[PDB]
Design a protein around this ligand. Structure first.
Ligand code: HEM
Length: 433
């Protein structure tokens, strides 16, 4: 007896539109908007997703209180990965007064990663940036000491965790599928790496977070936290900022290479700015215009999170369409960031959009959403931007990059809820001079 909301075409497979969502989620979300407008739905297994788009619908979505649109249970694929607390996990390291030190830490991690590059060579962006950001994340959020005890193994296993986010999780996150199996196995591997580090510290003692948790005794003198508990906490702290920063660093370089005029502009800028003799820790926290605009455009075109989920906790009305409790409600940066009315020539790379005269990011407060908006806006935004500035201030002044494959061959893999750059993503480098 209730009015059914508009539903997008297709979705006749076993789990509705889920199968298409696993193969081409952006095409699906775009068809929802093309056929229905600002409010439309698609079937995700046994759930109905009310996909909102456009300034009006997005405003409702982002300004909604935690009591109206709940985020907590919107991402089922995360529970098996982790194994209020949101503030704790990040807040601490994101304090402005700590940014300078983090920038210096990031610079050091980058230099360490490129220490063996030599005069010239070739890298794969996913392998490089995924590993690099594991080191930047662990160093800044857990401690340099802890990072120094990590190698490529931790990175490989963390990546397996991320790949264990198939949309099938919306059916059941524990289904006996290979990606879920590899996910659980990788988490056990991570717990083992942590246990090994804990043991090593026992035998032979700049203290970090692990030293703190390790010293915490219960009452009988027995350690309070197990390797599993600690690893779960560490995984939690590093997740929000890993795939996002990794992917964004990859696309920033790709777009720079695809657009040599912007690349040249950034180079000139970097050389001039650093001509003042100040460190990356100083400049990564201050204006670097051209690079910043290249980053903003890269994020508009390649938002690491293409869909944002919520669970309706009540009935609401958006444009005459009624949302019911239990309804999954979503917004899409992938789609919204390319609305033609809001962003002239939305498929074109135009950093100038963000220059003082245009400022399309600030003008479209509800549709330029790579970092989300409203109360749930990305709390790591300032940090992520600082990181890009620090990373490229190093890379672009030390090396020159060129695509080793067709410009159009670089693409993302959208088969999992966590988007990852697809491979190969081969790039050649050569020392600058
Ligand atoms: C340029 C890279 C990044 C992008 C594009 C990005 C994007 C986003 C987006 C779109 C959201 C909203 C999710 C939602 O509404 O469900 C978000 C949330 C969040 N991000 Fe990021 N993020 C980035 C880097 C980071 C980093 C490095 C950290 C770690 C400090 C971080 C921590 C968080 C947290 C804790 C939330 C949840 C905020 C809340 O519930 O209010 N992000 N991010």
């Amino acid at each position: 007896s209730a009015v059914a909301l508009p539903r997008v075409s297709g979705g006749h497979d076993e789990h509705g539109h889920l199968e298409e969502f696993r193969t081409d989620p952006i095409g699906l979300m775009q068809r929802v908007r093309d056929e229905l407008g600002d409010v439309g739905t698609f079937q995700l297994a046994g759930k109905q997703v009310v996909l909102l788009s456009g300034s009006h619908a997005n405003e409702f979505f982002f300004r909604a209180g935690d009591d109206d649109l709940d985020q907590a249970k919107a991402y089922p694929f995360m529970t098996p990965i982790f194994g209020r607390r949101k503030e704790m996990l990040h807040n601490a390291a994101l304090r402005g007064e700590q940014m300078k030190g983090h920038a210096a830490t990031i610079e050091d991690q980058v230099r360490r990663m490129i220490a063996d590059w030599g005069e010239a060579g070739e890298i794969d962006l996913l392998d490089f940036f995924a590993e690099l950001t594991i080191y930047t994340s662990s160093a800044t959020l857990i401690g340099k000491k802890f990072r120094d005890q990590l190698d490529g193994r931790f990175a490989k296993l963390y990546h397996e965790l991320e790949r264990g986010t198939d949309p099938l999780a919306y059916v059941d996150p524990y289904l006996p599928i290979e990606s879920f199996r590899r996910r659980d196995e990788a988490r056990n591997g991570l717990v083992a790496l942590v246990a090994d580090i804990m043991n090593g510290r026992i035998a032979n003692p700049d203290r970090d977070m692990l030293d703190v948790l390790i010293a915490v005794k219960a009452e009988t003198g027995t350690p309070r936290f197990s390797a599993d508990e600690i690893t779960g906490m560490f995984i939690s702290m590093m997740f929000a900022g890993h795939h996002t920063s990794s992917g964004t660093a990859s696309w920033t370089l790709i777009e720079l290479m695809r657009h040599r005029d912007a690349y040249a502009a950034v180079i000139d800028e970097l050389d001039e700015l650093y001509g003042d003799g100040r460190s990356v820790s100083f400049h990564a926290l201050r204006q670097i215009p051209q690079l910043e605009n290249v980053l903003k455009e890269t994020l508009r075109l390649h938002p690491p999170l293409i869909i944002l989920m919520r669970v309706a906790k009540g009935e609401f009305e958006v444009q005459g369409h009624r949302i019911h409790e239990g309804d999954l409600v979503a917004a899409s940066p992938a789609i919204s960031n390319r609305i033609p009315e809001d962003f002239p020539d939305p498929h074109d790379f135009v950093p100038a959009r963000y220059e003082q005269p245009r400022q399309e990011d600030l003008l479209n407060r509800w549709t330029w959403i790579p970092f989300g908006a409203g109360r749930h806006r990305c709390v790591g935004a300032a940090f992520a931007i600082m990181q890009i500035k620090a990373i490229f201030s190093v890379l672009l002044r030390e090396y020159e990059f060129e695509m080793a494959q067709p410009p159009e061959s670089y693409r993302n893999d959208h088969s999992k809820m966590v988007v990852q750059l697809a491979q190969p993503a081969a790039v050649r480098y050569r020392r600058r001079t």
